Design a protein around this ligand. Structure first.
Ligand SMILES: C#CCN1C(=O)[C@](O)(C(=O)O)Oc2cc(F)ccc21
Ligand SMILES: C#CCN1C(=O)[C@](O)(C(=O)O)Oc2cc(F)ccc21
Ligand code: FES
Ligand code: FES
Ligand SMILES: [Mg+2]
Ligand SMILES: [Mg+2]
Lengths: 569, 569
């Protein structure tokens, strides 16, 4: 697509954009401000780099990013350019999980994209270095780089180290776990609060192969982060060095005029998808990689994910599904070692250009390969699963698609009477009052989509409640929103069209026999198509849950989950 | 209106919102993050204050706000609460003026509103202290406070001091001036660059009674800033003290549960409008005060502004129209002294509650009144103008309203043949190639509205070019966008419906006789209504100038200029 969003520059000038305001005499007001913020006349000739961090104090994943941003600015100066720091908002899923605050989480990705686009466009910056540390902030920064198509590098803030107390290990999942184990009698109240004091020991995104580590890995695999960016821990001295080197690398990109639309291509998008399948990455990567592909005017469908999934085995023993964390990947050679193996297996395209100014194959040719004897990355011979964990389903009830994490452990079928809830709250109430009424059913939590939630919130408590009731393999779980963790059975999100839009999920009634077939990739109903259409003819959309503010704007702008919930089309 | 946007709290608890995540055991994940960012168990009991600054390095108005935010956080802690800093984006009109970057400026107000709303909602903060320093950021922060309706205080970053070099004085307007004076032969190239090195000497919003000082004054008059917030200079030691005291005042507001919808009322909105008229404030205050009124579920029309204008004289000798700057107001008693006089004149409502926990009259009862012999604030006896500078016009060509700054100096009428331009660029080209073709005409610059610009950009060069061509009193100027400065004649912006929407402004043709009548408050055309309707029947909307990114979303969401360009309705 021919994306029209942001200003074009006024051939090998390095200040292609800022010359708009630093050179013409008709822009004397611009130059006066720049002198006032401390630029000399000689500084006016230099490229201006927008340094967009996502620092804030109320989240471990973000509280350290200001220090990183100072390192990035110093490196930009040490490279002969002018560095201008600015900062946008972010929100913490770990804080807001379980609450209505979670309705504000997904859209913060698109707010951040808008934020950085706005500043780069208004201030005429020549290039960008972004420092996210957290979930939705990674893809938000890439989307703004794609819209602007000015040279850019994403510096991942880095993952948090695991927590340790008396030879037992924790992360944020342990803290999520602790309340269920408390009411379960599994642990006492004193054990439960030791969990919460010792779960997150410092700065960083959440420790496992969760959304943050998935996206940072995928973005590195996409060539838009420097090698090792995704795997160096947040608190590591080498993270600061990477910050200080981004300026040098960005200078080279301005010299080459190597732009994000030269780096983010169908093939580098595939490389990113390969990393997701190989590492067992989050199903949220489906939403974010589609948004990222759209931002550079490319197409990316649910079916493209199925094809890559089928072509790529699950190889990594990493939480949540497995046992290791991102720090362990760091210790055995980092993300470049992992990608080196995948490239040697012929699974990746090595000719894609990256922010090093070289191709992926040139980056990976001379990096230490995986540590001899490591048990995290299985060989192609003995994979954890022969194909990817990510599965697309499209039955009667998800005609426009849906997304599931499938281990190959759950069997190929589940059939049961539907048990329908209009939100997370009523589902949890019902399973507390009456767990046995759930045995054998297909639990449907609807009204949680992009418009219905609103905000397509991530829900963790339904899968926790089902496990703690002992129903993990004895029920299935469907939503137009998103589930956070796994059952030991069938769990499907992103069901499209969402219930708010009158998709078949909004027409289900209690007792309807729903059949999930993994092999046919279908979520079907025993209800006849004509009775479903009768239900459709009689359906009226429920009133929106908001009429003002950022979430009403989201409702007005957001596309379906199958379209990556983009908001600017 | 019954605004539904943001979460409701789970009677005299001070942590009405954060208890949602600090108290229930089912929110152990939340508490683990909070322990990791450094909260003790005792800290968990305290109120959590979101401290939203708009710091960034590429603008003199914003580069210092991080230091202010540290002072605010210390004061919040010294008051027994937990302070969590976060930061959003802003853009600089002084940098981007004259460029397509200016299309991103107005919408940044609404992006900021969305930004702060998002974080307060996701993180469950109990109250907010906002630190803007710049144009669109002031009203953006109030709008988020109104949506949330949690106790909040806006701390103005403060105005910049004027520049000084060899017993001559400058501000950003001097830098804007300098290029026109250069091509004019008025000044040399060396004099022109002395202007630009000595125009903005440090931190702060632009020095005159421009948008920033208008809005900060109006917001103080509205009771949503502490007394003197608007008039203390950015670099003043007392600004840091105000920062350090906001925590104490916010604590009292939580104790009283005095919320923004208890403070922003029809009467405090009128108080804010009174300050605008009395001080000669920017016509942008029309857009921002309407947006602010909408954010608390109130109504505010163009006609309400006309009524207050008629009821309130223009009293202040302040640039751009006059001679003094905000620092001078500071030296003669500040904004509270000005408001004290206006309250003594019976022009303001003294019973409105404010963020001090007291009413306006209680705040102003014991502040030093204006300095004896000051010549900035004229007496009611001898006003600069008997009524307000701000005028609403609604002829054939602006049926839904338009806004003009009228001094009472220009006469009551202008009639001339229309000279129509589809954008700022073609207007400036035409006036350079052929200035005399402009003599006696009504210059129409259309396609610059909220959707057409897009972004309703502010235009400075048309009024500069007209003055430098010697045509200041010999032509008139109309737009669906915004003009920055004054002619010495008739200059109208915000014309509604905008041309992009097929309003009569989009149907004007060269030669059409346009008559501006200030007394009747009408912009009329000699063209017959039936010929205008014929033109309308044949009109087709031009294609949007963008199809992606934040500005396309703006086009999709923004209401008319007459509706304050709100985006969330
Ligand atoms: C980044 C990160 C952590 N991450 C979270 O923190 C969570 O809240 C969770 O509970 O796993 O949401 C998630 C959902 C998902 F598919 C993958 C990861 C996460
Ligand atoms: C704040 C501020 C300064 N301010 C500007 O800086 C300007 O760019 C200008 O030239 O006056 O835009 C403006 C337009 C207006 F109506 C009032 C003020 C401004
Ligand atoms: S909450 Fe920030 S990475 Fe999970
Ligand atoms: S540009 Fe910031 S106040 Fe004028
Ligand atoms: Mg998450
Ligand atoms: Mg301005």
């Amino acid at each position: 697509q021919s994306v029209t969003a942001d200003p074009s520059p006024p051939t090998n000038k390095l200040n292609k954009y800022s010359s708009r305001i630093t050179e013409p005499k008709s822009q004397g007001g611009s130059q006066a401000i720049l002198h006032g913020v401390g630029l000399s006349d000689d500084d006016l000739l230099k490229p201006q780099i927008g340094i967009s961090s996502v620092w804030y104090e109320g989240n471990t994943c973000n509280m350290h990013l200001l220090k990183l941003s100072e390192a990035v600015k110093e490196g930009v100066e040490n490279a002969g350019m002018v560095g201008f720091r600015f900062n946008t908002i972010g929100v913490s899923d770990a804080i807001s999980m379980g609450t209505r605050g979670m309705c504000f989480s997904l859209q913060s990705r698109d707010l951040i994209a808008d934020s950085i686009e706005t500043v780069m466009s208004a201030q005429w910056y020549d290039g960008n270095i972004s420092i996210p540390g957290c979930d939705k902030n990674m893809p938000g920064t890439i989307m703004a780089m794609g819209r602007l198509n000015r040279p850019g590098i994403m510096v991942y803030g880095g993952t948090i180290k695991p927590g340790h107390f008396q030879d037992k290990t924790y992360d944020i999942v342990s803290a999520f776990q602790s309340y269920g184990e408390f009411v379960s009698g599994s642990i006492s109240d004193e054990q439960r609060k030791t969990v919460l004091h010792h779960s997150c020991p410092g700065a960083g995104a959440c420790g496992g192969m969760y959304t943050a580590n998935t996206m940072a890995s995928a973005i590195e695999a996409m060539g838009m982060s420097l090698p090792y960016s995704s795997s160096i821990p947040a608190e590591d001295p080498l993270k600061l060095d990477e910050c200080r080197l981004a300026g040098k690398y960005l200078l080279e990109l301005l010299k080459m005029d190597l732009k994000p639309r030269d780096i983010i291509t169908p093939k580098s998008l595939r490389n990113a998808m390969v990393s997701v399948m190989a590492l067992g990455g989050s199903t949220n990567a489906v939403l974010h990689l589609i948004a990222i592909a759209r931002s550079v005017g490319l197409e990316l469908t649910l079916d493209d994910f199925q094809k890559v999934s089928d072509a790529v085995p699950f190889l990594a023993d990493l939480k949540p599904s497995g046992k290791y964390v991102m720090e362990d990947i760091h210790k055995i050679g980092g993300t470049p070692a992992v990608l080196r193996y995948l490239l040697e297996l012929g699974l990746m395209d090595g000719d894609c250009m990256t922010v090093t100014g070289q191709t992926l194959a040139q980056n990976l040719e001379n990096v230490p390969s995986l540590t001899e004897g490591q048990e995290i990355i299985r060989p192609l011979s003995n994979p954890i699963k022969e194909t990817g964990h990510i599965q697309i389903l499209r039955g009667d009830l998800a005609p426009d698609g849906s997304v599931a994490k499938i281990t190959g452990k759950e069997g190929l079928y589940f059939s049961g009477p539907a048990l329908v809830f209009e939100g997370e709250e009523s589902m949890l109430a019902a399973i507390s009052a009456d767990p046995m009424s759930f045995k054998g059913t297909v639990v449907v939590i609807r009204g949680e989509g992009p418009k219905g939630g609103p905000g397509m919130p991530e829900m963790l408590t339904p899968t926790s409640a089902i496990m703690g009731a002992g129903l993990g393999k004895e029920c299935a779980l469907l939503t137009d929103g998103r589930f956070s963790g796994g059952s030991h059975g069938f769990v499907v999100g992103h069901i499209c069209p969402e219930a708010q839009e009158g998709g078949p999920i909004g027409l289900i009634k209690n007792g309807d026999i729903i059949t999930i077939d993994i092999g046919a990739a279908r979520i079907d109903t025993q209800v006849s198509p004509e009775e479903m259409n009768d239900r459709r003819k009689k359906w009226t959309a429920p009133a929106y849950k908001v009429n003002r503010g950022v979430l009403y704007k989201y409702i007005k702008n957001v596309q379906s989950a199958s379209d990556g919930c983009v908001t600017d089309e």
